[PDB]
């Protein structure tokens, strides 16, 4: 991150963007009903565990996601393919954990939000919705 | 090519998760 | 907000998006050096007060922004114009607070992050940077 | 049209802050 | 369209945008090699016919797309799903024609180009490529 | 451009995107009223002349626009500053010609459309609108 | 809901094209 | 820095255009 925080202006800009973003997230959560808050909590517990256990896997998978030929759009479609043939909870949790890791290492906020938004549609198929609502 | 293989490894990780669970 | 959360899918999708973004922001903060965290604290302290003190002013100004003919592009340029002549700290803090409020009420995460990114450049002019760096 | 006037209220608010912050 | 062209400014702004985009497309074409221009001719010939032959079908399908709950993200995934099982040329040409029609009626240039970019990846699977390359 | 047209798929994808984009532009123009068509024509004649005469200038200005530290957002604000102090037609035409040149050499379509959209707001101030309507 | 059905009409249209294109 | 100078050169080009016109 220090490769982008070169000048005082970069620091201050970073500070303002963080604040704007943090405030938005806090106020969003403030507005969410109990049901949605429960789902966030469930996703947190399960994906924190997956990301921790398979931390080494997530890291090298990122290393090839950083190759020139990689595109989020093609990756999205490959995920959509996988979910259609396999209906286990694991692969969906694993996909969330990986996209989250891609997000942590993406310093382009706009690109990141786009990735999050697109993949969230893809990951949340009726199969996934069934699992989270059962665990509710 | 890479996106095709990553998604395959996520499946493997997923099945692994499902079995230990 | 509850017009966006109609089905179970909408709820779960919202939960996934929140987790991804929250995780990103958490990891971003962990990477920030002391200097940037200090600037975040300063913006937090000063803009929270402006947002509270002028809360009524912020609300009614949002009502103007929800106008059909309002555009972030044009607003950015007017903000840029104001700051060139007005070099006080107040107008810069007030703009952040207003933009933050626009973010709280914007459900499209992509358009929101676009707005934050653009306006942060415009707000963080040399004058604003000088102010933030003076404090601590 | 609305953006011009909003930015002027921010200018007004900014002045109130500056005077009191002194 | 004429609801977007209310003031003289809206007209001039539209004129500037058109010039910039038209100039870009002109210069892009000049740079394309013979092979790519041939593929463009093939898509032009085949999708124009589909668009004309099934013009009524395209219009009523747009009416479904203008639905509140319709999203390009979800549509992309359904298209991806269809193409995996259906390997005929027709469904690929029809999708292009439909997406092209969505573009004609979309006034937001950013959302439109986003749609084109995403769906082009999804439509141009190995099967479609094999079809286009066979012709000439 | 050949650095991106590596595989048959890249060519075909390029072909589909061009078609979608070209069709949109053609149908947009088809819908434009005489007034807007006149403005496009006027912009075409004047900016073609500027781009031709100052072609060498536009080229080196691009070379520094390609430096890491360059951002469209900061450039936009600098343009907004310039226009506020100088009300001649020339600088506005020059800015259109330069942004157009930036567009010709940007292979990211989404980034390009964003640039076009933002700068079009900035360039089309009341001063510019007055000139184009006079030349009408 | 609407996207699922649209994509099926495209599938239908595609079949008409394939048969006639033969 | 570069954006600040480019915009300045566009002004110069603009004034040049206005004078020959
Ligand atoms: Cl951020
Ligand atoms: Cl969000
Ligand atoms: Cl356009
Ligand atoms: Cl958007
Ligand atoms: Cl393009
Ligand atoms: Cl982007």
PDB file of C-alpha atoms in Angstrom, chain F residues 64 69, chain H residues 1-6:
ATOM      1  CA  UNK F  64       3.038  12.918 -20.513  1.00  0.00           C
ATOM      2  CA  UNK F  69       1.138  10.241 -11.861  1.00  0.00           C
TER       3      UNK F  69
ATOM      4  CA  UNK H   1       1.970  18.106 -11.980  1.00  0.00           C
ATOM      5  CA  UNK H   2       1.587  16.806 -15.552  1.00  0.00           C
ATOM      6  CA  UNK H   3      -2.172  17.441 -15.626  1.00  0.00           C
ATOM      7  CA  UNK H   4      -1.488  20.975 -14.410  1.00  0.00           C
ATOM      8  CA  UNK H   5       0.944  21.675 -17.253  1.00  0.00           C
ATOM      9  CA  UNK H   6      -1.016  19.992 -20.059  1.00  0.00           C
TER      10      UNK H   6
END
